[model samples]
Every structure is written in structure tokens, then in C-alpha cells.
Target: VLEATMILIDNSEWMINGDYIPTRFEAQKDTVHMIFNQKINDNPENMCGLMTIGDNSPQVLSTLTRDYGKFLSAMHDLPVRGNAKFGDGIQIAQLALKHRENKIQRQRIVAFVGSPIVEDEKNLIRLAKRMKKNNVAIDIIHIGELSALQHFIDAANSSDSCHLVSIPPSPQLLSDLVNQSPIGQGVVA
Candidate 1:
């Protein structure tokens, strides 16, 4: 289906860990490139927005756009610093989605979270319910343990609209794993 997806990338200090081969940050960056291609290929009209969560505040690298060039340049010199502000990042992504050029497109958020979230479980779930009420689906591709994210997705998921994919250190390509997850499937599973 046609969609407007915001990709929230976590570039926190933790992402520099070498658990996921080269490094979690590099691996996640590679995955983002693949996901952007996949989204565009799925439907030419689909627009994807990019944002980073490890900065002092969430920064919108690019608003919803089909131009791969903009997306490419947005991630070109992103630095890995600060903490991952999951709450603020998600809020900003949703805000970006709300201003999508195509109202007909389904709203979604693809979050790559490799750092620890400081939010409490209840706070996360509350935000999830808010997104659910607004009919926005979020796909959380996370590395390492999760509890807040688990609650967030659980509250937001409905009719397979949302997904939570946990990735561990392994030889498998991170993008391939994400592609095989429910969010990567072209059709309903």
C-alpha cells in the first residue's frame, strides 16, 4: 500500500559498539539505505522521511520525499554522539508524518533503535496508544534488550499494523533480517 514512513535512526554513543560486525552504527546505516530503496520500490509514490535521535534533540534530516538524493545527503555526515531520545524522536517523526504531502498514504514510522531508551514503560505505552489512536503504525528494529519498546509496540499494534524486530549480533546482514520481518513482507502475513 502507498505510505508515508518516517525512519528514526538512533546514532547514540552505544551504536559505536562492535557487536554487530563493523559496528552497530555502520550496520544500521547500511540497513537504512536498504529500507529507503525498499520503500520506494514498493510504491513509487511512497515518501520516506529521515531523522536522527542521538543528537541533543531529534533532527529531521529530510522531510517526506521520494528523491533519494536528499535522503542520501541527509545521512552522509551524521555523527554518532549524545543519547538516544526515543520519546522526542518518535514524537517528531509523527509530527513529520502529519504534514505528509499525500493524505491518502498510510502513516508509518520505521525506528532503528540500538541504544537504551530512558523512558519508563508506562510513558512509552501511553505514546504508543496515542499513535494507535491516530492510525500511525511503527516498526521498531532494535538491537539489544528491550522492555519499553516492547510495551510501546504491543500497545500500538493492531491488525499487524506494527512490528517489533529484535536483532542480535550475528553474521546475518541486518537489512536482510529486517526485510524478512513482517514489515519487510510486501503483502499481509
Candidate 2:
């Protein structure tokens, strides 16, 4: 229903916990697969990319691809490292989306937040506002840990385009809940 999107995953050591069921990393993988399939299939021409933020620095696992083999490979061998550099990861997502083949495609950054913010809230909000000004919508999913990230959604969202989803502890799979969420059922943005 839209264009290009980038999924920013948090692969920090904190993600190895079992609070999200069968470990947060595994649950995140499923969620990534679900979103990738839904978004890439929404329009045959649409593109979706994957990136991971953890260990030392954030790396682009796969840059805007219709095929997900790269994403799977990167996920399985992900190295759990330092805390999530939440702000920088979003900027990376933005940069990746900017280079999409179709320049007119709507850009989005779907971030799976687990660790605490690397910087102060004011800095995060400023970063959000900058992206929002550039028409880059952000969807932040706060899993387990602290929920100080929804504020990022508020700072970036405009015209009801962006969203923030906070998933509580439950028996149902995190991927299942995400698939049924507004982001999963809606357009690429």
C-alpha cells in the first residue's frame, strides 16, 4: 500500500531475556519476518530493509531488499553486544530509506526498542522532530524494559501516520500481537 521501509532491530544483550517468551531475540525475529512479508507483499514493487543495533555499532544487515534471505542470515548470527544506541539507529534507518531506488517512496523506521535511551529525552525528541520534518514516520515498539520511548512516537508522528506499540508480558507470541497491530495490517508507512 506504500513504498520503502526500514526495520531497526535491537540486538543488545538485554534482548536475550525470556520475558518476551522464548527469548526477546527470537520473538523479534518472528516479528521481523512477519512485517517483512506483509510489507514487501503489500505491493510487489515495494521494498523493505533490515538493520541491527547492538554489540558495538549499528550495522545494516540488508539494505532494502525484496528477498529476505539476508535478513535471516544476519539474525541467526547476530552478536549480542553493547546497549542500544537508540537515537543513532533511527538516523541510520532514515539514511537507508533516503537511498531507496524510488526516491518518492514514503520512508519509515520501525524500531524494536528494548534497552534504555542512550541519550537524554530532549535529545531524542529533537531527533524525532528532525525526522518528522523530513516526512519520515517512525513506529516504535517498546518491548519489556522501560517504556520511555513512546515519547519518540509523539515527537515524530504527524497526520496519524506514525504509531507506538507497547507490548506487555503475555502468553501469546510477540510476533502474533505485532502482526495484528495497526502497523502489521496497514500500509508500508
Candidate 3:
């Protein structure tokens, strides 16, 4: 059976861009809706939680569960603001996973990093290593410039329990990119 997941959403101002159709936020919402639909249809035991990494600190909406209503409500309520702190977001996600009450068979963090990362590559790799040491898997969705994407990939490769994926700013290509990772089970596309 697939373990329950805690989704860490990026609601920073970068999501307001129009690069992806109506806007990045709209595209992300659509994808999240699809994830909810698929999870409910695929398995009754499967559950998902929601959190936002936005202007303020990271907010954890709910723990892992099959409650789609709560997840949607939390997603809609996320405030868009400030910068996207990718490294800090990852750390917060790890903390959430570590505190899961149930015996989750697997722990995974799905990060959507769109804005420019202020942390250098070395720092990101260091964070990844820390995550790996805790046996927490990280799957990064890098949707930005080529250089940034490459940097993310390099960081992921350096970590033992992490992998990075690059998706163009195209909605249609999201599923394909997500499917390529085993971590997809606990992550939203």
C-alpha cells in the first residue's frame, strides 16, 4: 500500500506568473485537483496532507489523510507573498514528515521550486545530505531557468535519498515528469 503524503506547496509570489497558461498558481491548482481525484479513486487508504511555503513561515494544514475537502480548503487559503526559500521549505517539510504519528511506510517530500534560489549549490547539497541522513526522500520539481534546473539536479544527485526532476513550464508535461520517480506515490503532480 502507498503511504500517506504531506504536500508542501509553494505559494510565493512567483506562482503569480503567467508563464503557465492563466498563471502558475492556476496551473498548480489544477494539478493538485487532479491529484486529489486520482488518490480518492485509486485507493481508499491513501491520504494526503497540505502545507504552504509562502510569504510567512511554512503552514501545515493537516496531517496525512483521505480528507480531500480539508486539503482543498487549505490550498485555497494559502496566501501568496515574499520570496521562495527553497532550502528552508525543504527543512520544514522534513520536520513535518519526521513528526508523522502513524507508522508511515515511507516518508517523502515533494518540493516545487520555481523562483530563484538564493542558497548556493553547496548549501543545497548540504541540506540534501542532512535529509538523506534522516532517511527522508526528497523529490524536487524544478521549473525555472536551465541553470537553476541543472543546479537542483546536481544537488539531488549528491544526496543518497533524493532525486530531482525538471519540468518545463508546461502543464501537459507534468504527469510524465512525475511518473519518472518512485516518490510519486506520496507526491502530487
Report lDDT per candidate: 0.86, 0.83, 0.64
Question: Candidate 2 on 33-133: residue-level lDDT in tens?
Answer: 88888878887878889988777578899988888898887677678767888878888888888889987678888889877778798898899899889
Residue-level error in angstroms, candidate 3, position 171: 7.5
Model 3 ranges off by over 4 Å: 35-45, 147-161, 170-189
Error of 3 at 160 (Å): 8.8
* TM-score of candidate 1 versus the correct structure, residues matched by position: 0.93
| Candidate 2 error regions (>4 Å) | 186-189
RMSD of each: 2.2, 2.4, 4.2
* lDDT order of candidates, top first: 1, 2, 3
lDDT of 1: 0.86
Best by lDDT: 1
Give TM per candidate. 0.93, 0.93, 0.77
Candidate 1 lDDT over 1-189, as tens digits, reads 799999989888888888886888888887887778778888879999999999668899999888878977988888898889998999999889989989999999999988878788888988899999999999999995446677789899988889889988888878777777776644533
